[PDB]
């Protein structure tokens, strides 16, 4: 393991010492059977990869293309412009937009949904390869995404649960703190008490 999440606790037995990002953190004893664990290894990967790509879309378009991650993207369409993406206007309209989303994802995911192998799913390689394929380099990079993903997921909450408290977007809510760290904190808010 690459460290322990809580120094002073022993390693849990059921988690085999070799897993990507094994800190021995399983407080609820969720998976005590390695059979069932594997599906959640595969799944923690996916939830991260979507979560990774989701974060820049929330920050950037607040501080770059100038829209919130929540109300701006969706609202502006109904009562307004079809899409402003990248500060540009495409043809595509509301209803027939989501129709395309099912053909593709349902085509993209279901094509992945059918595989015999667990490992070749989580880690397809193939056409996706053009990077380290070998030995410890891949084994190490294997840790790096699992680790960034955990951080990336754990951000997504902070995006939602700041916006429900503050109401401002993530960067607009960030910039407030770096200007004045005290008085702009979370403690003073409708969160704590």
């Amino acid at each position: 393991r690459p460290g322990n999440w809580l120094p002073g606790s022993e390693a849990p037995s059921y988690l085999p010492e070799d897993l990507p990002g094994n800190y021995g953190y399983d407080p609820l004893g969720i998976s005590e059977n390695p059979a069932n664990m594997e599906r959640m290894i595969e799944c923690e990967v996916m939830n991260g990869r979507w979560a990774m790509l989701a974060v820049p879309g929330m920050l950037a378009q607040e501080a770059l293309g100038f829209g919130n991650w929540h109300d701006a993207p969706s609202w502006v369409y109904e009562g307004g412009s079809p899409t402003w993406f990248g500060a540009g206007m495409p043809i595509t309209d509301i209803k027939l937009l989501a129709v395309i989303e099912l053909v593709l994802m349902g085509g993209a995911e279901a094509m992945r949904a059918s595989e015999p192998d667990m490992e070749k799913r989580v880690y397809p390689g193939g056409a996706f390869d053009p990077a380290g394929f070998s030995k410890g380099n891949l084994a190490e990079l294997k840790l790096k995404e699992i680790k960034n993903a955990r951080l990336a997921m754990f951000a997504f909450v902070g995006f939602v649960l700041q916006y429900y408290a503050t109401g401002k977007g993530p960067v607009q809510c960030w910039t407030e703190h770096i200007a004045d760290p005290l008085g702009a904190n979370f403690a003073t808010n409708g969160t704590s008490l």
Binding site: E32, N33, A35, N36
Partner: protein, 73 residues
């Protein structure tokens, strides 16, 4: 027509992958489809509660015209 579900092989795959429920739902479609009383216990329990559910809605949401005008009905 062979397209559909199988009652038993819906059930038999629901044993939770822990063992909290042990075998889970296993050979229940046996007991159910054989025992009548099991089928009748559900029928009265399901229909029984609805009888009450009718009475809970039907005074407060008086579907019929000109009730809640004559009260005693």
């Amino acid at each position: 027509f062979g397209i559909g579900h199988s009652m038993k092989e819906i059930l038999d795959m629901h044993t939770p992958p822990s063992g909290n429920l042990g075998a889970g739902h296993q050979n229940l479609f046996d007991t159910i489809n054989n025992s009548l009383h099991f089928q009748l216990g559900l029928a009265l329990a399901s229909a029984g509660t609805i009888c009450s559910m009718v009475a809970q809605h039907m005074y407060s949401l008086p579907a019929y015209a000109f009730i809640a005008s004559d009260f005693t009905t």
